[model samples]
Target: WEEELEKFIRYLKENDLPEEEKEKLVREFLRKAKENLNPEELFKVFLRIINEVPLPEEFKKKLVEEYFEWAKENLNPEELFKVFLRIINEVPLPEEFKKKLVEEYFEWAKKNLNLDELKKVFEKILKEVPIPEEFKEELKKRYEEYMKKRQ
Candidate 1:
């Protein structure tokens, strides 16, 4: 029932890797996306590959954007959180910038996704995920507002 993530996968596979290699990579992303979007095991593979490839910074940036694009469609909070951690560990972008990517994406995700589901994942991030402290506060405040809505 999922639309193939055409644009997002293009950025992921655009580097001159072979066909099946691209297949494995894209397969993993969607497979993980399929499996509750829980992708930690798959990303350990990516962390290794991302470092070795002669990847462009613009390419890196596009994948980050595309990741959020895919995440928006899939709406998996845990998957979104892992990318935050993995990108921090591997992507080498500016800290402020990475935070902004998730923050900005969260802004859009906030408007569109299931409210209770997003709230549950935000709480999970607070308890376990290694995301930025400031982003946690952003969720805290957002959840505070949500509390009022439910009351």
Candidate 2:
């Protein structure tokens, strides 16, 4: 399946397809690629597509789901947290969807990360990001501890 897509990319380069036609051809090939590839394998394939093709914005929005799943199984949710941050800045997902993603990501991280690691991640996050209020307070309780420690 991947070889098919790679061959399609070569075909595009050899032929003189216009911009709209190239996008259309790649789009159709991607739908088929999804069918043949495994879930774990599929996400990486899309990442490759992003680098190889200037895919449309709507397609980038679809990436959040693939990356989210990929992050769920991997040991490093923190890494994809940055990836999601980059995704949200460019993709046109709604504020509510973005909020859900943050909340879900934190819930995942809380279980996956250790105390100091979690603190550093949350501390870095509380600035401009719109996290859920419960987590905001959970994050802020650290300041109370720091305050007492300072004495």
Candidate 3:
């Protein structure tokens, strides 16, 4: 979970965005975190909201940190998935690909979805979304490492 949070931070830092924007984004993220909403729903909302706006790199990093901090207090994947589904909806992809993505995710969830797989999925997500290119290689490396472990 800490690793996943760090990945989110790494994603935001690698992108190019301003400081003030970061603060606002972070604040909004915190506000959502405080809502006592279902974890999955909150995560979904996070993705949905971010999709609608242009966030700064700094803000993304802050969001990552805030998300982790919040998760530390509350750990649950179904809730996290609720947050993550919004991210899936936000990314641009062919309908077929989206279907496949969901199918694969479910397949993984049924058996192999663990911390390592979650890291892989997160890294893949960063790649799928409009994340910075600089972050991709390392994220992929993490994904490959996770895969290797699973194998």
Candidate 4:
């Protein structure tokens, strides 16, 4: 089962499928996996592969937006933070784009979450996520500014 999952993930990473075909394949794969794996377990596997692979910039952004939409509807602030943190930590993209994406997330969180919630999210990300050291420092500076605005 693990091997099969790994193979599928490898295929996804190595191949550039058309958008429709990719979505269809993912849907079918998930549908089959659902019969065997619990949703949470499956999601973790999904995240692991997604984090490890380098997706095209457009596809990565599409996935981010998809995650954001689902999270806004389904997750509380803390849960949403975990999801976003994992994506930010793992998805390979240009530094400028990554910064912009994080800023966008922060802006959205500011509007939707309380100050305390925002701070907790940022704090968790800074402390726990496996980002590059320099990027981590940059995120810390951003977090400090974000916190200052609340005071």
* Candidate topping TM-score: 4
Candidate achieving the largest lDDT: 4
Error of 4 at 112 (Å): 3.0
Lowest lDDT 10-residue stretch of candidate 1: 1-10
Provide the lowest-lDDT 10-residue window in model 4: 48-57
lDDT tens digits, residue span 33-74, model 4: 645675455556656555665544576666656555555665
Residue pairs that clash (backbone atoms under 3 angstroms), model 2: none
Scored by lDDT, model 2 comes in at 0.63
Off by over 4 Å in 2: 1-63, 75-78, 128-151
> Candidates' lDDT values, in order?
0.60, 0.63, 0.53, 0.66
Stretch of 10 with least lDDT, candidate 2: 83-92
Question: Per-residue lDDT tens digits of candidate 1, residues 1-151?
Answer: 1233444445665677875566566546645554653455444544544454445565556556665566566546656666665675566776667767656656765776587767765665567545678777876887788768967
Model 3 residue 40 lDDT score: 59
Task: State every prediction's TM-score relative to the real structure.
Answer: 0.49, 0.48, 0.37, 0.55
Off by over 4 Å in 1: 1-49, 56-58, 74-85, 88-90, 108-113, 131-135, 146-151
State candidate 1's TM-score. 0.49
lDDT of 3 by residue, 42-98 (tens): 565555434544565445444644654565456555544544454345554445444
- Candidate 2 versus the native: TM-score? 0.48
Q: How do the candidates rank by lDDT, highest first?
A: 4, 2, 1, 3
For each of the candidates, give the backbone clash count. Answer: 0, 0, 8, 0
